Amino acid sequence: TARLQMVKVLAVLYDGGEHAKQVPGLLGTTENELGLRKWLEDQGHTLVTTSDKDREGSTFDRELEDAEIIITTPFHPGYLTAERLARAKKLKLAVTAGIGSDHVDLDAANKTNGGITVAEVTGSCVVSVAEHVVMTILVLVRNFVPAHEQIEAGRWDVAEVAKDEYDLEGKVVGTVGVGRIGERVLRRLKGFDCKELLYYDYQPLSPEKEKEIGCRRVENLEEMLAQCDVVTINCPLHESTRGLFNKDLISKMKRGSWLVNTARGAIVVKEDVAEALRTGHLRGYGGDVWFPQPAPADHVLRTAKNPFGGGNAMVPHMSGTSLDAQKRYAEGVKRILDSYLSGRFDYRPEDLIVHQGKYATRAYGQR
Amino acid sequence: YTARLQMVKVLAVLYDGGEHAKQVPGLLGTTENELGLRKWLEDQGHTLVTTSDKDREGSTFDRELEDAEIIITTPFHPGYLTAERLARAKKLKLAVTAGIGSDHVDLDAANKTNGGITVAEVTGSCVVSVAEHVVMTILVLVRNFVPAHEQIEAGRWDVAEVAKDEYDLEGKVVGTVGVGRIGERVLRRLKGFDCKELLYYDYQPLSPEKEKEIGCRRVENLEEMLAQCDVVTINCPLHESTRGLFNKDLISKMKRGSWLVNTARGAIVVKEDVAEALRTGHLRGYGGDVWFPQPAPADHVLRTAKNPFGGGNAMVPHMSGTSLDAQKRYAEGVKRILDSYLSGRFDYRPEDLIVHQGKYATRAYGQREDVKIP
Ligand SMILES: NC(=O)C1=CN([C@@H]2O[C@H](COP(=O)(O)OP(=O)(O)OC[C@H]3O[C@@H](n4cnc5c(N)ncnc54)[C@H](O)[C@@H]3O)[C@@H](O)[C@H]2O)C=CC1
Ligand SMILES: NC(=O)C1=CN([C@@H]2O[C@H](COP(=O)(O)OP(=O)(O)OC[C@H]3O[C@@H](n4cnc5c(N)ncnc54)[C@H](O)[C@@H]3O)[C@@H](O)[C@H]2O)C=CC1
């Protein structure tokens, strides 16, 4: 089979600056280019890399017009809007360096240049995120953030921070989505002796996995939320999950509950989370995802607090770009690129989000 | 029939809850709520005096301990029962820890005081709480949460700046110093994370069945364990052989860029040696909740020490064992121990006894000859 020739690749990655020289394991940066440059150039392909992706007349906007392959990364996402896809005359393959391709307009992608392939590195980040979720759950439940702030400020008052400190043992935790991340969340929670582990997903766990992990499927999302002390969101962003966690749905959670979101920022309504924390309906909110990204400097969830001055465990979009994750998605991006550039188009099916004008996943809504 | 003891003076040293202890009545272990003991004691004809004033020359504690028959302390705000103080406690028969860890009592002096006083604590009451705190603090450090959260709250955004020290716990080697109630529960919670290996060092080993069930390996030499670990967690009591155990020389046996967690006792580490190991980047992180002394002085170096990248510090006040769920359990356990004494039965749970009848009654405070268990 004849290899494709002189393919223009465009990568939109985050700037590593000095950090990417201190730590060469920052592969997914404009400096280190996922370790792809020599590999592409030796085949006669070209690579243009940028972090300039937002402003009118950005490098991304100029370069996407004749790029055949566009590599994006969720942590600093080149948003492939319908407007931009309509100008991407040569685009055949959009690869996500990581997991979650919702920064691409997938419906528009299906109608672009005969239907472009949108692929991501399935599995590459999922342990990383699951760990981050259990971390965040513990941080919130155990009231870590204001306790650490008290120490660094030179103060000492045990009651002040113990008054909102609980154990995770004996609490009910529910996951929205029991895919590769949600399942691995429940597998990490098993040893904590939660009162119950619940899930809501239109794609269920097998009975054997339910028994092995020790968890129960709840058929109705609102019924799950009403029983949970902790809720974690582990579903993709698609039309039916955008703004899902609005004031009305959050009001179904228990008063004083904890909400974690390492999925996608746009699944929650940021003002509704901030208001629920402000009135004490939520005890805490945390995770690493925002909409848009970079998160605006004034984004309300940078500084929103519960009525006691805690309950915020937000970080930048980092869980899936741990140094261990980056090695896996850099290798996976090379693998997806080789499937295309070889002319084989022999993608792993689980890497495909849209392909040949159709959705190629069950996980972006019931279709 | 056994004759109950009568008109017993109880002294409790607890932390002040102020307004917090009224906002949240679940703060049982406070000077306000008195572990729910006051009416229960008074109805039997006993008296209770409670204070948080325990440190200064001429403290309430120093005055009241002279004729207290029972002294209740709590690790989170510890009335230090020094040899000097025990020598002045002419009526003391029972010292009860509201929580776990009785190292704030001079146990050798306790064994020589008033014919050998009973020192009891509520074994098991806090152990889940602390084990969860350990795993939380391990993840916080390994995934570089603290500087990432600070970045967000300051209004900044730089993924690379905080990803460059962000690792997964999967594939890392974790070792625990001590595999008792807390250390075993730490390994039980780390099992789901697919660590490369789970190690322990303890002169009291796990059964072979529990080693296989949890999936962990006993390392016979402490330094050999430290050299193999990416993460070390200290889960042993404070006693003569563990005081200042984690000094510069022992820390130097840990890997460069390792993470150290201490929810056990502050005095097990040499604070200046931890700070220097963090500041030169031999440690990537240090965290936990325990200090020496407590309250931690305002200028304690581990409040503010950082790794060379401005992270690495996951310290909190002494709180893991005083979660609201723990407090319910140790408040009930203190009542149970008090009832064993006040009834004249002295029918303590053996596992609650640290010293009794002039002898250590535990194997967990060092390897001893003439350990006498009920
Ligand atoms: N914070 C981070 O760095 C990362 C975030 N993610 C995000 O997490 C998402 C999930 O990742 P995986 O678990 O690997 O995907 P997955 O595809 O293995 O599992 C996703 C699951 O969500 C379910 N789902 C879809 N809509 C739902 C709904 N309305 N309610 C409940 N469940 C629903 C699907 O049926 C599927 O079982 C990704 O799509 C991505 O948005 C993933 C990796 C990195
Ligand atoms: N941060 C907090 O709020 C709390 C901290 N603690 C501290 O944790 C300590 C351990 O508690 P548990 O696990 O419940 O006690 P435990 O008695 O069940 O287990 C302690 C284990 O440490 C071992 N040990 C003693 N010296 C050692 C050494 N040099 N090296 C290795 N192992 C050694 C003992 O043999 C024993 O198996 C307590 O004594 C207390 O100091 C416990 C509860 C609350």
What would the DSSP string read from start to end of B273-329? HHHHHHHTTSEEEEEES--SSSSPPTT-GGGT---TTS--EEE--S-GGGSHHHHHH
- Is the distance from CB of A93 to CB of A343 less than 8 angstroms? no
Instruction: Verify cis geometry, omega within 30 degrees of 0, for the bond prior to B293.
Output: yes
Query: CB B256: neighbour CB atoms within 10 A?
Result: 11
Inter-chain touch A318–B191, beta carbons under 8 Å: no
Residue numbers of B between 139 and 168 with CB closer than 8 Å to A: 139-140, 143-146, 148-149, 151-153, 155-168
* Separation between Cα atoms, residue A238 and residue A243, nearest integer Å: 10
What are the residue boundaries of the structural domains of chain A, listed by start?
Answer: 8-122+321-359, 126-316
Q: Taking Cα atoms as reference points, which of B265, B182, B175, B156 lies closest to residue B216? A: B175
Q: What is the DSSP string of A312-334?
A: EEE--S-GGGSHHHHHHHHHHHH
Which ligand minimizes its atom distance to the CA of B237? Answer: 2
CA closest to B139 among chain A residues: A135
A193-218 burial string, b = 16+ CB within 10 Å, else e? bbebbbbbbeeebeeeebeebebeeb
Which ligand minimizes its atom distance to the CA of A219? Answer: 1
- Is the distance from CB of B76 to CB of B334 less than 8 angstroms? no
The three-state secondary structure class of B22 is helix
Inter-chain touch A318–B148, beta carbons under 8 Å: yes
Q: Which two tokens stand for residue A1?
A: 């089979």
What technique was this entry resolved by? X-ray
B3-34 burial string, b = 16+ CB within 10 Å, else e? eebeebbbbbbbbbbbebbeebebbbbbbbbb
* B9-121+323-360 and B127-311, same CATH topology: yes
Write phi, then psi, for A13 (nearest 5 degrees). Answer: -135, 165
Task: Estimate to the nearest angstrom the gap between the alpha carbon of B260 and the chain centroid.
Answer: 16
Nearest residue CA, atom 8 of ligand 1? A263
Q: Which two tokens stand for residue A163?
A: 């008054």
Q: Which two tokens stand for residue A342?
A: 């070889």
Q: How many angstroms separate the most distant Cα atoms in chain A?
A: 71
- Is the distance from CB of B114 to CB of B89 less than 8 angstroms? yes
* Separation between Cα atoms, residue B133 and residue A42, nearest integer Å: 51
Q: Which residues of B touch A134 (CB under 8 A)?
A: 135, 139
* Separation between Cα atoms, residue A319 and residue A101, nearest integer Å: 16
User: What is the DSSP-derived secondary structure letter of residue A86?
Assistant: H
Q: B222-225 contacts: CB < 8 A, separation 24 or more? A: B222/B177, B222/B250, B223/B250, B223/B253, B225/B175, B225/B177, B225/B199, B225/B200, B225/B201
C-alpha pair distances (Å), B283 with each of B151, B170, B332: 22, 19, 40
Spatial CB neighbours of B68, under 8 Å, sequence gap ≥ 6: B9, B10, B11, B49, B89, B91, B92
Spatial CB neighbours of B276, under 8 Å, sequence gap ≥ 6: B248
Task: Estimate to the nearest angstrom the gap between the alpha carbon of B130 and the chain centroid.
Answer: 8
Q: Cα(B203) to centroid of ligand 2, in Å?
A: 12
* Separation between Cα atoms, residue B195 and residue A310, nearest integer Å: 31
* Separation between Cα atoms, residue A295 and residue B85, nearest integer Å: 57
Q: Taking Cα atoms as reference points, which of B344, B271, B266, B268 lies closest to residue B304? A: B271
- The owner of tokens 């992706």 is A53
The three-state secondary structure class of A335 is helix
Tell me which architecture the domain covering A126-316 has in CATH: 3-Layer(aba) Sandwich (3.40)
* Separation between Cα atoms, residue A196 and residue A177, nearest integer Å: 16
- Is the distance from CB of B290 to CB of B318 less than 8 angstroms? yes
- Choose the CATH number for B127-311 among 3.40.1130.10, 3.40.50.620, 3.40.50.720, 3.40.80.10: 3.40.50.720
Q: Which two tokens stand for residue B212?
A: 């296989």
Give the gap in angstroms from C-alpha B291 to the nearest C-alpha of chain A. Answer: 11
- Indicate the pairing of strand B217-218 with strand B197-201: parallel
Top residue of A124, A129, A148 to mutate, by most chain B CBs within 10 Å, is A148
Q: Please give the number of the atom of ligand 1 that sits closest to the Cα of A182.
A: 13
- Is the distance from CB of A178 to CB of A204 less than 8 angstroms? yes
Give the sign of the dihedral formed by CA A11, CA A13, CA A19, CA A22.
negative
Asked whether A320 lines ligand 1 (CB < 6 A), one says yes
Nearest residue CA, atom 22 of ligand 2? B236
Query: CB A312: neighbour CB atoms within 10 A?
Result: 23
Spatial CB neighbours of A153, under 8 Å, sequence gap ≥ 6: none
Count of residues for chain A?
367
- Choose the closest CB to B193 out of A156, A188, A297: A188
- Is the distance from CB of A269 to CB of A300 less than 8 angstroms? no
CA closest to B303 among chain A residues: A152
* Separation between Cα atoms, residue B135 and residue B198, nearest integer Å: 13
Instruction: Verify cis geometry, omega within 30 degrees of 0, for the bond prior to B295.
Output: yes
* Separation between Cα atoms, residue A133 and residue A258, nearest integer Å: 12
User: What is the DSSP-derived secondary structure letter of residue A221?
Assistant: H
Q: What is the DSSP string of B225-283?
A: HHHH-SEEEE-S---TTTTT-B-HHHHTTSPTTEEEEE-S-GGGB-HHHHHHHHHTTSE
Q: Which two tokens stand for residue A327?
A: 């090695």
Q: Which two tokens stand for residue A102?
A: 């919702």
Inter-chain touch A314–B77, beta carbons under 8 Å: no
* Separation between Cα atoms, residue B164 and residue B143, nearest integer Å: 10
Task: Estimate to the nearest angstrom the gap between the alpha carbon of B111 and the chain centroid.
Answer: 22
Strand-pairing partners, residue B97, are B73, B121
Q: Which two tokens stand for residue B170?
A: 């999967």
Q: B34-39 contacts: CB < 8 A, separation 24 or more? A: B35/B72, B35/B98, B35/B330, B35/B331, B35/B334, B35/B335, B36/B331, B36/B335, B37/B10, B37/B12, B37/B72, B37/B331, B37/B334, B37/B335, B37/B338
Spatial CB neighbours of B78, under 8 Å, sequence gap ≥ 6: B13, B54, B104, B293, B294
Spatial CB neighbours of A1, under 8 Å, sequence gap ≥ 6: A342, A343, A344
Which ligand minimizes its atom distance to the CA of A122? Answer: 1
Q: Which two tokens stand for residue B332?
A: 């009930």
Inter-chain touch A294–B157, beta carbons under 8 Å: yes
Q: Which two tokens stand for residue A142?
A: 């155990």
CA closest to A130 among chain B residues: B193
Burial class (CB in 10 A: 0-12, 13-18, 19+), B266: buried
- Choose the closest CB to B163 out of A147, A302, A322: A322
Task: Estimate to the nearest angstrom the gap between the alpha carbon of B197 and the chain centroid.
Answer: 25
Q: Cα(B329) to centroid of ligand 1, in Å?
A: 39
Asked whether A306 lines ligand 1 (CB < 6 A), one says no
Q: Please give the number of the atom of ligand 1 that sits closest to the Cα of A184.
A: 13
Nearest residue CA, atom 4 of ligand 2? B321
Residue B15 touches chain A, beta carbons under 8 Å: yes
Give the gap in angstroms from C-alpha A367 to the nearest C-alpha of chain B. Answer: 34
- Helix and strand tally (H, E) in chain A? 14, 14
Asked whether B181 lines ligand 2 (CB < 6 A), one says yes
Residue A316 touches chain B, beta carbons under 8 Å: yes
Q: Please give the number of the atom of ligand 1 that sits closest to the Cα of A203.
A: 35
Inter-chain touch B21–A135, beta carbons under 8 Å: no
- Choose the closest CB to A166 out of B152, B166, B324: B324
Strand-pairing partners, residue B173, are B197
- Choose the closest CB to A165 out of B169, B194, B323: B323
Inter-chain touch A166–B21, beta carbons under 8 Å: no
Spatial CB neighbours of A354, under 8 Å, sequence gap ≥ 6: A106, A109, A110, A115, A116, A117, A118, A360
Q: Cα(B182) to centroid of ligand 2, in Å?
A: 7
Instruction: Report the amino acid identity of residue B63.
Output: R
Q: Taking Cα atoms as reference points, which of A9, A14, A65, A11 lies closest to residue A293? A: A14
Radius of gyration over every alpha carbon of chain A, rounded to an integer in angstroms:
21
Give the gap in angstroms from C-alpha A231 to the nearest C-alpha of chain B. Answer: 18
* Separation between Cα atoms, residue A195 and residue B191, nearest integer Å: 19
Q: Taking Cα atoms as reference points, which of A186, A83, A268 lies closest to residue B193? A: A186
- Is the distance from CB of B15 to CB of B74 less than 8 angstroms? yes
- Choose the CATH number for B9-121+323-360 among 3.40.50.720, 3.40.109.10, 1.10.10.10, 3.60.15.10: 3.40.50.720
- Is the distance from CB of B282 to CB of B251 less than 8 angstroms? yes
* Separation between Cα atoms, residue A235 and residue A232, nearest integer Å: 9
Inter-chain touch B303–A152, beta carbons under 8 Å: yes
* Separation between Cα atoms, residue B306 and residue A75, nearest integer Å: 26
C-alpha pair distances (Å), A243 with each of A247, A248, A265, A269, A290: 10, 11, 9, 5, 12
Spatial CB neighbours of B46, under 8 Å, sequence gap ≥ 6: B7, B8, B9, B10, B342
Give the gap in angstroms from C-alpha B139 to the nearest C-alpha of chain A. Answer: 6
* Separation between Cα atoms, residue B133 and residue B144, nearest integer Å: 16
Instruction: Report the amino acid identity of residue B25.
Output: P
Asked whether A69 lines ligand 1 (CB < 6 A), one says no
- Alpha helix stretches (DSSP H) within chain A: 19-22, 37-41, 59-63, 82-87, 106-110, 126-141, 144-152, 158-162, 180-189, 207-213, 221-227, 247-250, 270-279, 323-341
Nearest residue CA, atom 2 of ligand 2? B321
Write phi, then psi, for A258 (nearest 5 degrees). Answer: -115, 135
Q: A27-35 contacts: CB < 8 A, separation 24 or more? A: A27/A326, A27/A327, A27/A330, A28/A73, A28/A75, A28/A97, A28/A98, A28/A321, A28/A326, A28/A329, A28/A330, A29/B160, A34/A71, A34/A97, A34/A329, A34/A330, A34/A333, A34/A334, A35/A330, A35/A334
Q: Which two tokens stand for residue A123?
A: 């599995």
Q: How many CA atoms lie within 13 A of B63 on its CB side?
A: 10
- The owner of tokens 């092995």 is A212
Q: Taking Cα atoms as reference points, which of A212, A142, A126, A226 lies closest to residue A177? A: A126
Asked whether B364 lines ligand 2 (CB < 6 A), one says yes
Q: With breaks defined as C to next N over 2.5 Å, after which residues does chain B break?
A: none
- The owner of tokens 């962990």 is B216
Strand (E) or helix (H) holding A310: none
CA closest to B318 among chain A residues: A158
Size of the A and B interface in Cβ pairs below 8 Å: 217
- Indicate the pairing of strand B359-360 with strand B353-356: antiparallel
CA closest to B168 among chain A residues: A128
- Alpha helix stretches (DSSP H) within chain B: 20-23, 38-42, 60-64, 83-88, 107-110, 127-142, 145-153, 159-163, 181-190, 208-214, 222-228, 248-251, 271-279, 324-342
Give the gap in angstroms from C-alpha A342 to the nearest C-alpha of chain B. Answer: 32
Inter-chain touch B139–A134, beta carbons under 8 Å: yes
Strand-pairing partners, residue B314, are B287
Q: Which two tokens stand for residue B195?
A: 């660590």
Sheet architecture: strand order including A8-12: A46-50, A8-12, A69-72, A93-96, A117-120, A352-355, A358-359
CA closest to B25 among chain A residues: A163
* Separation between Cα atoms, residue A53 and residue A62, nearest integer Å: 10
Tell me which architecture the domain covering A8-122+321-359 has in CATH: 3-Layer(aba) Sandwich (3.40)
- Indicate the pairing of strand A46-50 with strand A282-287: unpaired
Give the gap in angstroms from C-alpha A295 to the nearest C-alpha of chain B. Answer: 7
* Separation between Cα atoms, residue B115 and residue B93, nearest integer Å: 9
CA geometry: angle B82, B86, B90, nearest 5 deg? 165
- Is the distance from CB of B6 to CB of B65 less than 8 angstroms? no
* Separation between Cα atoms, residue A97 and residue A100, nearest integer Å: 9
C-alpha pair distances (Å), A78 with each of A126, B163, B199, B293: 21, 19, 44, 52
Q: Taking Cα atoms as reference points, which of A271, A297, B91, A296 lies closest to residue A285? A: A271
- Is the distance from CB of A70 to CB of A80 less than 8 angstroms? yes
Inter-chain touch A19–B164, beta carbons under 8 Å: yes
Q: Ligand 1 pocket test: pick from A131, A198, A201 the residue with the most ligand atoms within 8 Å of its Cβ.
A: A201
* Separation between Cα atoms, residue A170 and residue A350, nearest integer Å: 36
Query: CB B48: neighbour CB atoms within 10 A?
Result: 19
Strand-pairing partners, residue B70, are B10, B94
Instruction: Report the amino acid identity of residue A311.
Output: G
The helix-helix angle for B127-142 and A126-141 (nearest 10°) equals 130
Radius of gyration over every alpha carbon of chain B, rounded to an integer in angstroms:
21
Give the sign of the dihedral formed by CA B134, CA B136, CA B139, CA B144.
negative
Q: Which residues of B touch A280 (CB under 8 A)?
A: none
- Is the distance from CB of B54 to CB of B81 less than 8 angstroms? no
Instruction: Report the amino acid identity of residue B357.
Output: Q
CA dihedral A303, A307, A309, A315 (to 10 degrees): -40
